[PDB]
């Protein structure tokens, strides 16, 4: 349907990342439909704002 | 006395990020003498107090229901976290405790088919259009049918059934019209569980030789 | 103090001619101390004598389970009859009457249908062979799977779902090996129902 | 093995509309008692279960109104 794909993706992956721990992994996905993540505001997580905060998470998770 | 039950979350809540799963602590038989009723909910031991109780609700038998709704983290669930409702009540000998989880065991992707009408079913007006989904774990799933990126609605989904390898499988059964089918169009049977990429997948369904 | 449960025959056995229909009267949470129970049963109000009581069997939560066992007329049960089971033990203030009879409202015949396996199946060593029944009003049915006049012993069958014109439909899954579907093998799904001409009919499945 | 003609017969009784309870439950029992085993070889064949449908329709066709 109307799916906003990016933003599920991203939570799948996040909750996937084997290296963060609890604290991050909530504070990831809280992220992804609390406005954190919606970068300009606009009250929709864009795509653009989904892969920008999945990278932040692979990122955190590699430097683990 | 009172009784308790105590509800999961819709498998779909938890498992789609847009959705917000919710465990749900139902009282019933509570009497007009002694109406009152407290709720204490536990996550995994530790008491939590953003829970939400409704309004009583009197029955057509005169006795009340009372309602209290958890939020859960879709994360919380799917990690096996284990959700304690506690109810006390002057008319109870002591409270009662009721826990839910996910079902614990390793889990396993489903395997999704679908399957056109039975050529004997060809003849009758409304036709079956089938979706076998098969040897998953747990049996917490989802499905749902669509058409052109809109949900069909005119099908019913059978409950898990534990297959001879600790799996489980379901059918799920879309009824459309002949000549809907006889033209070509194009049905979808959605899937959603835990053990998917993304937490779903479609499989098609169309009028093939 | 103890619980009684009162449960029908299995619908094969009130379908079939050749086999015996039982209504079966389960005791729960009986006393080690008051283990004595009394079963007294009526066909229609009148007492009959032809039960037979199981000896008792102590469960894992210690408590024994006594079972009584009567054998029905299929034409008895089919025409709504009632059973009554009264239960007697010394822990119960009074005695515990439960009745049943056969599921009322206006049998509707089964659509039975057969589906093979999706192609798509055709790579995994084992397919599944699909029996849909649909349309068939009550719930009580039985299914069951064979092919060359003998039974098949992988199949799964889906608990009754109401559909939305007030009737029932299932699945039965039978799981073969792929070679067996792919030598042309003819299975058959039989179903047993009350709304079906001798209350069984079958129907065939096999590749070409 | 089932038994077809021994399953139809019961079937066929068990519908007919003019026979009262006793008789319909009559013939029904004779399908496993023996009664309907003429002759004596423990199975009700084919002949028999015929046989004893084509009775009991004789009846229900007699009483009808
Ligand atoms: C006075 O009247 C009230 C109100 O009347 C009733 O409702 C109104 C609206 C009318 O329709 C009336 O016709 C009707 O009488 C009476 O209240 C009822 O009390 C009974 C207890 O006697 C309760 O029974 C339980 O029901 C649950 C299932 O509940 C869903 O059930 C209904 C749908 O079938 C629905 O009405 C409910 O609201 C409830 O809804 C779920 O709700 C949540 C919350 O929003 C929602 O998220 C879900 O999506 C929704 N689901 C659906 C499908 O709609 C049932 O589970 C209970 O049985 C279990 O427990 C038994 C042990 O107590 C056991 O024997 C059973 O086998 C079963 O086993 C449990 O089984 C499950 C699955 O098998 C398993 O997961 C559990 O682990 C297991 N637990 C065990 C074994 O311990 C039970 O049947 C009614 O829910 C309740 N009605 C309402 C609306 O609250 C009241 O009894 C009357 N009192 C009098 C006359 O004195
Ligand atoms: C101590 O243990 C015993 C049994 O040990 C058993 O041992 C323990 C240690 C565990 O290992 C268990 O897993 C194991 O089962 C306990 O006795 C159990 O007690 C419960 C109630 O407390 C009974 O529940 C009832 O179950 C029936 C269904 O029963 C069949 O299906 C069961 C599977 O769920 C199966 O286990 C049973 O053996 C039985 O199996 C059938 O058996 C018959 C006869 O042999 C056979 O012909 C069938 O072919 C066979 N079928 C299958 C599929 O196996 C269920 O129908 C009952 O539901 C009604 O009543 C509930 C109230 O308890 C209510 O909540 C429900 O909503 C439902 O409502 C009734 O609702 C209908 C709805 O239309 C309505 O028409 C009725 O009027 C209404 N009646 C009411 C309300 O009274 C019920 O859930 C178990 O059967 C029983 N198990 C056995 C083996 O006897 C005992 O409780 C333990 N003591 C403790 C813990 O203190
Ligand atoms: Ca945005
Ligand atoms: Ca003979
Ligand atoms: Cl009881
Ligand atoms: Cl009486
Ligand atoms: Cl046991
Ligand atoms: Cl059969
Ligand atoms: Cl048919």
């Given amino acids: 349907n109307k799916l906003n794909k990016e933003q599920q993706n991203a939570f799948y992956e996040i909750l996937h990342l084997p290296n963060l721990n609890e604290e991050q992994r909530k504070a990831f996905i809280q992220s992804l439909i609390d406005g954190g993540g919606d970068?300009?505001?606009?009250?929709?997580?864009?795509?653009?704002?989904?892969?920008?905060?999945?990278?932040?998470?692979?990122?955190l998770n590699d430097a683990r | 006395g009172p009784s308790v039950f105590l509800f999961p979350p819709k498998p779909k809540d938890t498992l789609m990020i847009?959705?917000?799963?919710?465990?749900?602590?139902?009282?019933?038989?509570?009497?007009?003498?002694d109406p009152e009723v407290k709720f204490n909910w536990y996550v995994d031991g530790v008491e939590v107090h953003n829970?939400?109780?409704?309004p009583r609700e009197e029955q057509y038998n005169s006795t009340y229901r009372v309602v209290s709704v958890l939020t859960?983290?879709?994360?919380?669930?799917?990690?096996?976290?284990?959700?304690?409702?506690?109810?006390?009540?002057?008319?109870?000998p002591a409270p009662i405790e009721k826990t839910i989880s996910?079902?614990?065991?390793?889990?396993?992707?489903?395997?999704?088919?679908?399957?056109?009408?039975?050529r004997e079913e060809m003849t009758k007006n409304q036709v079956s259009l089938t979706c076998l989904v098969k040897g998953f774990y747990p049996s917490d799933i989802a499905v749902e049918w669509e058409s052109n990126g809109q949900p069909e609605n005119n099908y019913k989904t059978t409950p898990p059934v534990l297959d001879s390898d600790?799996?489980?499988?379901?059918?799920?059964?879309?009824?459309?019209?002949?000549?809907?089918?006889?033209?070509?169009?194009?049905?979808?049977?959605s899937v959603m569980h835990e053990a998917l990429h993304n937490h779903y997948t479609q499989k098609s369904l169309s009028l093939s030789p």
């Fill in chain 1, 39 to 59: 970068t300009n505001g606009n009250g929709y997580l864009d795509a653009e704002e989904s892969a920008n905060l999945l990278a932040e998470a692979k990122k």
């Fill in chain 2, 18 to 33: 847009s959705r917000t799963p919710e465990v749900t602590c139902v009282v019933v038989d509570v009497s007009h003498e």
């Fill in chain 2, 51 to 54: 829970a939400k109780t409704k």
């Fill in chain 2, 72 to 92: 859960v983290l879709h994360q919380d669930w799917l990690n096996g976290k284990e959700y304690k409702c506690k109810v006390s009540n002057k008319a109870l």
């Fill in chain 2, 102 to 118: 996910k079902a614990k065991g390793q889990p396993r992707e489903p395997q999704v088919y679908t399957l056109p009408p039975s």
């Fill in chain 2, 166 to 189: 600790g799996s489980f499988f379901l059918y799920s059964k879309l009824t459309v019209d002949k000549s809907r089918w006889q033209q070509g169009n194009v049905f979808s049977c």
